[PDB]
């Protein structure tokens, strides 16, 4: 609403096109080595045999200018086509579904996107998730119990200083370590960083 | 195209505004080069430092981290790479970012990915011991983390050997950097042929401006000057168009490099 | 003042380091205060507290909306030779 200059790309595309047309038109007023830049006068000032020479000069100059203009247009069109292909991919992947490739649309974990129209382009509003308010903890890679080693099915072990819990990785939410969120593999004599603790199972108290 | 001659400039003045367009195109190309480098490398907000004590579960990054001993603060591999690859109205402008700054970006990115993982690419860098970051990365390709904790030393040794092998391959085997050399050679050849084109008559009586200017009558001297002028304009326009094509191709390559940096360095693909 | 990019007059060199306002070259650029010229600063500086048994876990979150702008078209023009 207030801040300007946020639409530089569309604006400068328009400016480039307008400047190209302006210089192409303004090139019409050049002698190119002839006696005048107006065709009617040189037609009406001297006999044909030299008029053909003058028209030849004018014609070659204007042809060169036109060819230059067209070549520039082709280059710019190729660039715009590349941009449009990128926009189509972004619309298909970030608007019609949730994307996993990092930083493709938005900085952070992508949640969704919305499109809006603009005079010669498109504007994507990316809605993303950003974690905050960190906190440090002490961690271990596995837990010893009865000589066996336990690893978390999903999450990570942490301790606040006295007790150990498992949490999901992206949001602090501790839970008691149980035989339902951990799995066993071999004895604990090879892993570097194992810590002693206890793992509670929810069947023994129920049975009694 | 005039080489400090009043008559040439006066005769050229009636050709409209041609070389203004050429200067505009070249300026656009240079600005694009700076934007390319900025987009590829300035992927981070802060500048991270690796801790003085280095115990990454047995992994060894000494060959890739910078060493304070050298003044450029570059790494071993970067020094190998830098050693392997090696006026008439035209100028070469220096890049905006000097080499030390680019090395500093690379060092920051690499320290961040060693210590934090992919977290520093989304929010604030969060520390994580390297072994369990590797366990997470195994978990993302279909292998249980269990495996890594029981084959840690073997994995570390394999990684170290691979690093040493790639270092030796770069150090001994040459011609591994063909692309950069090709770019440099193409630019040099184009500039050289543009310069050498100045020694052509293009149908006039001499390829030197002073002799034709100071030998005979102006009335036809202007015709000779016109011959020289049109030839040199054609050469210059051809040069500029080639430069534009090459710039477009390089920009495509740089966009690809930016995507690869974003997707394979700051995350797991 | 003399710089690797050339010779600069009308501004004074300082020993500070801020962000880059008007890029001059060779890693230096200028800004207005009088006009001063300085060396770029790549950003802030921090040393993340690495250790082999310490982790950091977020406790809260924010939801951010950002914008991206892409051109997709340009004006269609046509030229008549013989009339031009
Ligand atoms: C670590 O967390 C545990 C679990 O929340 C804490 O242990 C309990 O803390 C509450 C609150 O002080 C007490 O009412 C309970 O009696 C504690 N024990 C149990 C078995 O619930 C522990 O205090 C925390 N320690 C630190 C340093 O934060
Ligand atoms: C974490 O790192 C510290 C320091 O690098 C380790 O502490 C050393 O452990 C070894 C073997 O356990 C001892 O021989 C040293 O005397 C210890 N030194 C210090 C200063 O503590 C610690 O063992 C590591 N922990 C894990 C789980 O890898
Ligand atoms: C965790 O528990 C194990 C077993 O309860 C401990 O291992 C014993 O340690 C004592 C003293 O260090 C030795 O005399 C025993 O031979 C060890 N084995 C057994 C089966 O008792 C271990 O020290 C405890 N602590 C840690 C950090 O692992
Ligand atoms: C990481 O690998 C490098 C390989 O270069 C080790 O550096 C070598 O260390 C040995 C042992 O002192 C020396 O004999 C070599 O001269 C070193 N090579 C170089 C090029 O300096 C380094 O020691 C390894 N890291 C650790 C912690 O051992
Ligand atoms: C988590 O605890 C560690 C251990 O203290 C913190 O690392 C240092 O903490 C002290 C305060 O106890 C600070 O003065 C240091 O600056 C910290 N180290 C560094 C390199 O900055 C760590 O900062 C704590 N994490 C958080 C988020 O506060
Ligand atoms: C997570 O952050 C939000 C803010 O983004 C916290 O909500 C604020 O809480 C304070 C104190 O209760 C209020 O004064 C603010 O008005 C709240 N903001 C909003 C937008 O509602 C929230 O408390 C944080 N989570 C936790 C667990 O503290
Ligand atoms: C800036 O630092 C240099 C050396 O780093 C020193 O010689 C100079 O006196 C300092 N001040 C100014 C104004 O240059």
Swiss-Prot record, chain A:
**What happens when you mutate residue 154 to K?**
In strain: Theta/P.3
Q: List the residue ranges forming a coiled coil, or say none.
A: 11-55
The effect of residue 16 to H is: In strain: Omicron/BA.1, Omicron/BA.2, Omicron/BA.2.12.1, Omicron/BA.2.75, Omicron/BA.4, Omicron/BA.5, Omicron/BQ.1.1, Omicron/XBB.1.5, Omicron/EG.5.1
Q: What is the effect of changing residue 31 to K?
A: In strain: Omicron/BA.1, Omicron/BA.2, Omicron/BA.2.12.1, Omicron/BA.2.75, Omicron/BA.4, Omicron/BA.5, Omicron/BQ.1.1, Omicron/XBB.1.5, Omicron/EG.5.1
According to the UniProt record, where is the region Heptad repeat 1?
A: 1-32
The listed outcome for residue 133 to H is: In strain: Kappa/B.1.617.1
| List of glycosylated residues | 136, 160, 196
Recorded consequence of changing residue 12 to N: In strain: Delta/B.1.617.2, Mu/B.1.621
Q: List the disulfide bonds.
A: 94-105, 144-188
Reported effect, residue 163 to Y: In strain: Theta/P.3
Q: What does this protein do?
A: Subunit of the fusion protein that is processed upon entry into the host cell. Mediates fusion of the virion and cellular membranes by functioning as a class I viral fusion protein. Contains a viral fusion peptide that is unmasked after S2 cleavage. This cleavage can occur at the cell membrane by host TMPRSS2 or during endocytosis by host CSTL. In either case, this triggers an extensive and irreversible conformational change that leads to fusion of the viral envelope with the cellular cytoplasmic membrane, releasing viral genomic RNA into the host cell cytoplasm.
Task: Give the protein name, as stated in the record.
Answer: Spike protein S2'
Organism, by scientific name, is Severe acute respiratory syndrome coronavirus 2 (2019-nCoV)
Shown segment, full-protein numbering: 939 to 1146 of 1273
């Amino acid at each position: 609403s207030s801040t300007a200059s946020a639409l530089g790309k569309l604006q400068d595309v328009v400016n480039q096109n307008a400047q190209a047309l302006n210089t192409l038109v303004k090139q019409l007023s050049s002698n190119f080595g002839a006696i005048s830049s107006v065709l009617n006068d040189i037609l009406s000032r001297l006999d044909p045999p030299e008029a053909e020479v003058q028209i030849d000069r004018l014609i070659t100059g204007r042809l060169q200018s036109l060819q230059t203009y067209v070549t520039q247009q082709l280059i710019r069109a190729a660039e715009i086509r590349a941009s449009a292909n990128l926009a189509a991919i972004k619309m298909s992947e970030c608007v019609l579904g949730q994307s996993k490739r990092v930083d493709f649309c938005g900085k952070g974990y992508h949640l969704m996107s919305f499109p809006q129209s603009a005079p010669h382009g498109v504007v994507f509003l990316h809605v993303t998730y950003v974690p905050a308010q960190e906190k440090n903890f002490t961690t271990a890679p596995a837990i010893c119990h009865d000589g066996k080693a336990h690893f978390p099915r999903e999450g990570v072990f942490v301790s606040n200083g006295t007790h150990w819990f498992v949490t999901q990785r992206n949001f602090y939410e501790p839970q008691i370590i149980t035989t339902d969120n951990t799995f066993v593999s071999g004895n604990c004599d090879v892993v570097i960083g194992i810590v002693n603790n206890t793992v509670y199972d929810p069947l023994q108290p129920e049975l009694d | 195209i005039c080489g400090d001659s009043t008559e040439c400039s006066n005769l050229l003045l009636q050709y409209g505004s041609f070389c203004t367009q050429l200067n505009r195109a070249l300026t656009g190309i240079a600005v694009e080069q700076d934007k390319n480098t900025q987009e590829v490398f300035a992927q981070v907000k802060q500048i991270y430092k690796t801790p003085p004590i280095k115990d990454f579960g047995g992994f060894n990054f000494s060959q890739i981290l910078p060493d304070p001993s050298k003044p450029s603060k570059r790494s071993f591999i970067e020094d190998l790479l830098f050693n392997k690859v090696t006026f008439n109205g035209l100028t070469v402008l220096p890049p905006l970012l000097t080499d030390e700054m680019i090395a500093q970006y690379t060092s920051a990115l690499l320290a961040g990915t060693i210590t934090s993982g992919w977290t520093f690419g989304a929010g604030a860098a969060l520390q994580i011991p390297f072994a369990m970051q590797m366990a997470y990365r195994f978990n993302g390709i279909g292998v249980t983390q269990n495996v890594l904790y029981e084959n840690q030393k073997l994995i570390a040794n394999q990684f170290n050997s691979a690093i040493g092998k790639i270092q030796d391959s770069l150090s001994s085997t040459a011609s591994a950097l063909g692309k950069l050399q090709d770019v440099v050679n193409q630019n040099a050849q184009a500039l050289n042929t543009l310069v050498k084109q100045l020694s052509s008559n293009f149908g006039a009586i001499s390829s030197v401006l002073n002799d034709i200017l100071s030998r005979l009558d102006p009335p036809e001297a202007e015709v000779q000057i016109d011959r020289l002028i049109t030839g040199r304009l054609q050469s210059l326009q051809t040069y500029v168009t080639q430069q534009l094509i090459r710039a477009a191709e390089i920009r495509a390559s740089a966009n690809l490099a930016a995507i690869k940096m974003s997707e394979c360095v700051l995350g797991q693909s | 003042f003399q710089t690797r990019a050339g010779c600069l007059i009308g501004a004074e060199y300082v020993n500070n380091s801020y962000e880059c306002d008007i890029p001059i070259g060779a890693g230096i650029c200028a800004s207005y205060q009088s006009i001063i010229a300085y060396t770029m600063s790549l950003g802030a500086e921090n040393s993340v507290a690495y250790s082999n048994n310490s982790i950091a876990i977020p406790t809260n979150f924010t939801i951010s909306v950002t914008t991206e702008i892409l051109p997709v078209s340009m004006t269609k023009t046509s030229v008549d030779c013989t009339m031009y």
